[PDB]
Amino acid sequence: ILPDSVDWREKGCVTEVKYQGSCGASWAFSAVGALEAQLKLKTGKLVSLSAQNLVDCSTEKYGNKGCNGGFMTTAFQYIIDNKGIDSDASYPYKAMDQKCQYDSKYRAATCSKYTELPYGREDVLKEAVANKGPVSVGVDARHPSFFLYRSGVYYEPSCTQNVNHGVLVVGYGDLNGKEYWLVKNSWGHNFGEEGYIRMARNKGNHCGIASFPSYPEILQG
Ligand SMILES: O=C(CO)N1CCc2c(c(-c3ccc(C(F)(F)F)c(SCCN4CCC(F)CC4)c3)nn2C[C@@H](O)CN2CCCCC2)C1
């Protein structure tokens, strides 16, 4: 049995919406966002983590291509391997590819492990969002209705399950019979609902929302 509604913002576990700009780094924002919530849960402090650290440093060895795209899973693996990720304040976002400038002096989080969830299992995604925290996912955002979304529960008939844009599921709910996922985007505050989009839930893995979910953990010790 799971709660009907979850919103991790209400628990102080979600940083401000970021603005990725011309750099295709949504995969990096998806990853730091999920890790930011685990960090808050563990330490009580809400700290933006460095998406730029991932763009510059979680590169070819991790199958990623910086501003040309990447994976949250291998972003997490880089953080594990690196034994750290810097704070965003110490290593801020420039929306461009740069040399890796990681400096452990400003490490703001670690990552013990990450977990991947089954493709298309929206019931499994729901349990993880409720019991673990915000979950990194990909969505199919290659539709003008996505770029032009303003408000409400987003449903795009021509959406597919093949994902191309990283986002953060920070909750879910039901608005008078329309079930939705609460999704943090990285297109700044003027996109959608103060930078968030509520996306149709339990509608056959709509827009691939549960195609590739993953979440990191920071274990005691
Ligand atoms: O959607 C479908 C089919 O339904 N995909 C085909 C299979 C697939 C897809 C994704 C996936 C998940 C999240 C995101 C996003 F959130 F960022 F948006 C994306 S965006 C595409 C990211 N890409 C762009 C070109 C390159 F720069 C490499 C990164 C894709 N993961 N996987 C599974 C594996 O292939 C992952 N791989 C396993 C071996 C080790 C490395 C990771 C896309």
Side-chain angles (χ1 to χ4, degrees), residues 2-60 62-82 84-98 100-221:
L2 293 325
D4 286 339
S5 300
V6 172
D7 184 350
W8 284 106
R9 294 177 296 186
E10 299 183 341
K11 260 53 180 169
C13 289
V14 186
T15 65
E16 280 287 289
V17 162
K18 307 300 192 301
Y19 185 82
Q20 78 180 74
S22 57
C23 172
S26 65
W27 62 278
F29 287 105
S30 177
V32 296
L35 189 58
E36 283 155 6
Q38 302 301 308
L39 177 66
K40 166 62 183 200
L41 261 6
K42 179 179 192 293
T43 69
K45 274 178 234 302
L46 185 62
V47 177
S48 293
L49 301 177
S50 173
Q52 195 66 59
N53 192 165
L54 295 180
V55 167
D56 299 341
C57 309
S58 182
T59 55
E60 281 95 308
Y62 298 91
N64 299 328
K65 305 198 194 300
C67 290
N68 295 118
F71 304 105
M72 293 84 82
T73 59
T74 64
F76 298 140
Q77 190 60 53
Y78 161 82
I79 303 175
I80 302 171
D81 293 347
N82 196 58
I85 181 170
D86 284 330
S87 68
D88 186 79
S90 79
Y91 197 158
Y93 184 69
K94 307 292 180 195
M96 53 178 48
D97 296 303
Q98 323 173 124
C100 180
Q101 293 154 63
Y102 175 75
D103 182 349
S104 65
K105 178 187 182 175
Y106 298 99
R107 184 176 67 187
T110 60
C111 178
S112 305
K113 62 189 281 197
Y114 71 93
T115 301
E116 289 171 85
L117 302 185
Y119 189 123
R121 290 291 300 279
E122 285 185 85
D123 54 331
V124 176
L125 178 54
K126 182 192 177 176
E127 170 182 64
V129 172
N131 290 339
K132 303 290 175 174
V135 177
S136 295
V137 303
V139 290
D140 175 12
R142 288 173 187 175
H143 306 274
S145 64
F146 194 100
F147 290 108
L148 299 169
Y149 166 85
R150 298 305 324 147
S151 72
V153 179
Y154 178 76
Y155 182 80
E156 168 55 57
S158 80
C159 215
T160 73
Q161 291 178 61
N162 307 127
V163 302
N164 44 66
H165 180 65
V167 291
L168 215 217
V169 179
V170 303
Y172 61 78
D174 187 343
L175 180 73
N176 292 334
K178 285 318 182 170
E179 294 183 315
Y180 63 84
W181 295 109
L182 185 58
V183 176
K184 185 196 195 187
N185 202 359
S186 53
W187 285 354
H189 291 77
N190 298 319
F191 168 82
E193 291 174 340
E194 286 77 47
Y196 288 82
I197 174 163
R198 290 182 277 175
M199 297 179 68
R201 177 163 68 84
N202 293 331
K203 292 287 182 172
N205 190 25
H206 183 249
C207 295
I209 192 98
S211 289
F212 295 102
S214 61
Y215 64 90
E217 280 171 80
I218 317 176
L219 307 174
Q220 180 190 341

